[PDB]
Design a protein around this ligand. Structure first.
Ligand SMILES: Nc1nc2c([nH]c(=O)n2[C@H]2C[C@H](O)[C@@H](CO)O2)c(=O)[nH]1
Ligand SMILES: Nc1nc2c([nH]c(=O)n2[C@H]2C[C@H](O)[C@@H](CO)O2)c(=O)[nH]1
Length: 252
């Protein structure tokens, strides 16, 4: 795990933060969010993207497919009242059919909230209170990453996220951490012990110069290839190889 930790650091050190930012523009999720922002403008588009991130849990299929549906839905539809229209979308989407009333309830709490795209740290604190969760919880930090996508699209700029916002420990991140040999307890346990997993990726961030929410992009892109055998050039070959250390960590 210490030896694996060193291998991971010295491999990702090969990629600058500049290369990571470039790689990140090819995330299918970035394209969906950017299509919605181009259609609706910065304020409305960023609100829609925010709401989508806040309910991106217990999906039927892949994260990426859910985001593609979101992009197509809002890119070709006029939006008048944001709460109403978003709740209607929740009732329609095949990715969101599980626990729809609890989803609507969460969306209703954050409905009227306008995020501050220039101070994402302030926004994370505000979201923690509105939604009612610890700031390190996976859906909160993932929402910050989505907000960065919306800002970068809107303004046509790069922006490197802070080191002090940790990685979102979903089931994909937990499995990949296990697959790279960085943890000895199972991925299902890692979801509960998310702070311990966050501590590992913080170490990696400090030593590589790649902040945790940008590391998240590398794991998600790599996961597409290791778990499903798809988008095989999403990251360099040597990055993929890091997450194939344990037996089972290959496509069927
Ligand atoms: N870590 C992470 N999670 C994602 C991504 N896309 C997506 O839909 N998710 C989901 C998984 C989980 O339910 C929530 C927080 O991680 O967001 C994504 O790119 N990264
Ligand atoms: N479409 C919809 N809107 C709802 C529900 N519950 C609720 O409080 N609303 C809110 C959204 C918005 O702020 C207002 C309609 O304009 O009513 C609900 O169940 N559906």
């Amino acid at each position: 795990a210490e030896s694996q930790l060193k291998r991971v650091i010295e491999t990702l050190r090969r990629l600058g933060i500049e290369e990571v930012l470039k790689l990140e523009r090819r995330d299918p999720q970035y394209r969906a969010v950017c299509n919605v922002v181009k259609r609706h403008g910065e304020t409305v588009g960023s609100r829609l993207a925010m709401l989508n991130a806040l309910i991106s849990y217990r999906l039927t299929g892949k994260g990426e497919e859910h985001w593609e549906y979101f992009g197509k839905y809002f890119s070709q539809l006029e939006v008048i009242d944001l709460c109403r229209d978003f709740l209607k979308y929740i009732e329609t989407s095949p990715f969101l059919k599980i626990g729809v009333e609890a989803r609507k309830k969460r969306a209703l709490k954050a409905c009227d909230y306008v995020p501050n795209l220039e101070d994402l740290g302030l926004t994370l604190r505000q979201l923690s209170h509105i939604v009612g969760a610890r700031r390190e919880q996976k859906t909160l930090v993932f929402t910050i990453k989505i907000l960065n996508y919306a800002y970068m699209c809107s303004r046509g700029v790069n922006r490197v996220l802070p080191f002090d916002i940790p990685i979102p420990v979903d089931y994909r991140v937990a499995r990949l951490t296990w697959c790279a040999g960085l943890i000895d307890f199972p991925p299902e346990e890692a979801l509960r012990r998310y702070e311990a997993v966050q501590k590992i990726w913080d170490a990696v961030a400090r030593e590589t110069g790649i902040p945790p929410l940008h590391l998240d992009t590398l794991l998600w892109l790599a996961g597409r290839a290791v778990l499903y055998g798809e988008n095989l050039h999403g990251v360099p070959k040597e990055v993929i190889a890091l997450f194939q250390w344990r037996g089972g960590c290959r496509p069927p």
